[PDB]
Amino acid sequence: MGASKLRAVLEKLKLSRDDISTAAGMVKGVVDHLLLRLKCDSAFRGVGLLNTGSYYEHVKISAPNEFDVMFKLEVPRIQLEEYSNTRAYYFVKFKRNPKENPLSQFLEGEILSASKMLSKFRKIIKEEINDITDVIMKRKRGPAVTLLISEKISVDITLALESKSSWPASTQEGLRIQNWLSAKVRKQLRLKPFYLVPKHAKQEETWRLSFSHIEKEILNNHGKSKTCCENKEEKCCRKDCLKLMKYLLEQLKERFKDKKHLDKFSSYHVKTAFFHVCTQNPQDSQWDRKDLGLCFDNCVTYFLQCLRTEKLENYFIPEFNLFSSNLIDKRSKEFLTKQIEYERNNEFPVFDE
Binding site for Zn ion (CB under 5 A): 223, 228-229, 236
The residue among 309, 305, 252 whose CA lies nearest residue 276 is 305
Q: How far is the CB of 223 from Zn ion (least distance, A)?
A: 4
Q: How far is the CB of 170 from Zn ion (least distance, A)?
A: 30
Nearer to Zn ion (CB atom), residue 242 or residue 312: 242
- Any known ligand binding at 214? yes
Q: How far is the CB of 286 from Zn ion (least distance, A)?
A: 11
Q: How far is the CB of 235 from Zn ion (least distance, A)?
A: 7
Q: How far is the CB of 185 from Zn ion (least distance, A)?
A: 15
d(CA 156, CA 158) in angstroms, rounded, equals: 7
Long-range CB pairs of 55-58, under 8 A, 24+ apart, other chains included: 55/20, 55/24, 56/216, 57/215, 57/216, 57/219, 57/220, 58/219, 58/220, 58/239
Nearer to Zn ion (CB atom), residue 94 or residue 287: 287
- In the chain, the amino acid numbered 88 is A
d(CA 212, CA 222) in angstroms, rounded, equals: 15
Nearer to Zn ion (CB atom), residue 59 or residue 229: 229
- Any known ligand binding at 276? no
- Any known ligand binding at 33? no
- Any known ligand binding at 123? no
- Any known ligand binding at 292? no
Long-range CB pairs of 254-262, under 8 A, 24+ apart, other chains included: 255/339, 255/350, 255/353, 256/335, 256/339, 259/335, 261/331, 261/332, 261/335, 261/336, 262/332, 262/335, 262/336
- Any known ligand binding at 306? no
3-state secondary structure of 244: helix
The residue among 277, 297, 288 whose CA lies nearest residue 347 is 297
- Are the C-beta atoms of residues 278 and 238 closer than 8 Å to each other? yes
Let me know the angle formed at the C-alpha of 258 by 256 and 260, rounded to the nearest 5 degrees. Answer: 80
Nearer to Zn ion (CB atom), residue 157 or residue 236: 236
Nearer to Zn ion (CB atom), residue 168 or residue 223: 223
- Which residues face 49 on adjacent strands? 71
Instruction: Show Cβ contacts of residue 76 under 8 Å, excluding neighbours closer than 6 positions.
Output: 97, 164
Nearer to Zn ion (CB atom), residue 148 or residue 228: 228
d(CA 156, CA 66) in angstroms, rounded, equals: 8
- Are the C-beta atoms of residues 198 and 207 closer than 8 Å to each other? yes
- Any known ligand binding at 232? no
- Any known ligand binding at 278? no
Nearer to Zn ion (CB atom), residue 219 or residue 306: 219
Q: How far is the CB of 225 from Zn ion (least distance, A)?
A: 8
3-state secondary structure of 228: coil
- Any known ligand binding at 263? no
Q: How far is the CB of 334 from Zn ion (least distance, A)?
A: 35
Q: Which residues does the annotation place in the binding site for ATP?
A: 54, 66-68, 212-215, 246, 267-271
Q: Which residues does the annotation place in the binding site?
A: 52, 54, 66-68, 156, 199, 208-215, 222, 228-229, 236, 246, 267-271
Q: Which residues does the annotation place in the binding site for Mg(2+)?
A: 66, 68, 156
